[PDB]
């Protein structure tokens, strides 16, 4: 929550949401380092194996 | 900052290709202190193994 | 899950972390506006209210 | 009312903000700017327009 | 090792070094993380941060 800016975060600038153009935590261009489910919306981002 | 908000959002503060090319025409320095700090290497390489 | 109907109505009785993870309708609603996660206000209410 | 509520978060419209909640965002400072666009409509104490 | 090709640079596990064991310490690694896009340079600054 505090990292969200929950004041002034609304809409739809582009396809990604706009907390998602303001601090890390939120893009789903970032992955954590440990993972278990690869998320929903990975059409963003690659993937190499 | 909330008026200074025009001079801060130019796409011209977040250009680095004149920066870059400035930094390529200045080369590589040359000092015997400089020559620590110059080597690095970055290679890609599949994640299989 | 399958015998419960969410009712999002009001200012404050509505916000999304409950109702929207109940039905899959308005999941499928918040999952392509995902900037519509707010409580102050919220994501829209519909135009019957 | 309220069988239908599913019915209006199939429809995948980005409702827009009203002037109010456009009017909220706004901080003390911020508030006498003329980088604000909803002044144009605060012209009561008493009422809204 | 790609550390210009991290999201997450020299700067944090450094401070993952020195920092004691409070809240404060876990959430100031969330504000460490804000965007520098002019989009976010926009908002940071409207919230007077």
Same mark, same amino acid.
């Given at each position: 929550?505090?990292?969200?800016?929950?004041?002034?975060?609304? !809409?739809?600038?582009?396809?990604?949401?706009?907390?998602?153009?303001?601090?890390?935590?939120?893009?789903?261009?970032?992955?954590?380092?440990?993972?278990?489910?690869?998320? =929903?919306?990975?059409? !963003?981002?690659?993937?190499?194996? | 900052?909330?008026?200074?908000? @025009?001079?801060?959002?130019?796409?011209?503060?977040?250009?680095?290709?004149? /920066?870059?090319?400035?930094?390529?025409?200045?080369?590589?320095?040359?000092?015997?202190?400089?020559?620590?700090?110059?080597?690095?290497?970055?290679?890609?390489?599949?994640?299989?193994? | 899950?399958?015998?419960?109907?969410?009712?999002?109505?009001?200012?404050?009785?509505?916000?999304?972390?409950?109702?929207?993870?109940?039905?899959?309708?308005?999941?499928?609603?918040?999952?392509?506006?995902?900037?519509?996660?707010?409580?102050?206000?919220?994501?829209?209410?519909?135009?019957?209210? | 009312?309220?069988?239908?509520?599913?019915?209006?978060?199939?429809? =995948?419209?980005?409702?827009? =903000?009203?002037?109010?909640?456009? @009017?909220?965002?706004?901080?003390?400072?911020?508030?006498? @700017?003329?980088?604000?666009?909803?002044?144009?409509?605060?012209?009561?104490?008493?009422?809204?327009? | 090792?790609?550390?210009?090709?991290?999201?997450?640079?020299?700067?944090?596990?450094?401070?993952?070094?020195? /920092?004691?064991?409070?809240?404060?310490?876990?959430?100031?690694?969330?504000?460490?993380?804000?965007?520098?896009?002019?989009?976010?340079?926009?908002?940071?600054?409207?919230?007077?941060?």
């Amino acid at each position: 929550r505090i990292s969200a800016l929950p004041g002034l975060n609304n !809409g739809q600038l582009a396809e990604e949401p706009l907390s998602a153009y303001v601090n890390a935590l939120h893009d789903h261009r970032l992955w954590p380092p440990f993972v278990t489910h690869l998320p =929903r919306n990975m059409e !963003g981002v690659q993937v190499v194996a | 900052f909330v008026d200074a908000l @025009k001079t801060l959002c130019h796409p011209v503060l977040h250009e680095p290709a004149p /920066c870059l090319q400035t930094f390529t025409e200045r080369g590589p320095p040359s000092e015997p202190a400089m020559q620590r700090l110059l080597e690095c290497r970055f290679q890609q390489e599949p994640m299989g193994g | 899950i399958e015998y419960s109907l969410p009712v999002p109505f009001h200012r404050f009785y509505s916000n999304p972390t409950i109702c929207a993870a109940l039905s899959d309708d308005i999941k499928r609603y918040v999952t392509e506006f995902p900037h519509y996660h707010r409580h102050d206000g919220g994501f829209p209410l519909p135009t019957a209210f | 009312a309220a069988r239908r509520i599913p019915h209006f978060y199939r429809v =995948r419209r980005e409702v827009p =903000r009203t002037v109010n909640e456009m @009017k909220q965002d706004f901080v003390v400072t911020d508030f006498y @700017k003329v980088g604000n666009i909803t002044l144009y409509t605060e012209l009561h104490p008493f009422f809204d327009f | 090792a790609h550390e210009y090709h991290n999201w997450l640079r020299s700067p944090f596990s450094r401070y993952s070094a020195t /920092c004691p064991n409070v809240l404060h310490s876990v959430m100031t690694l969330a504000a460490m993380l804000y965007k520098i896009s002019p989009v976010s340079l926009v908002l940071q600054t409207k919230a007077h941060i």
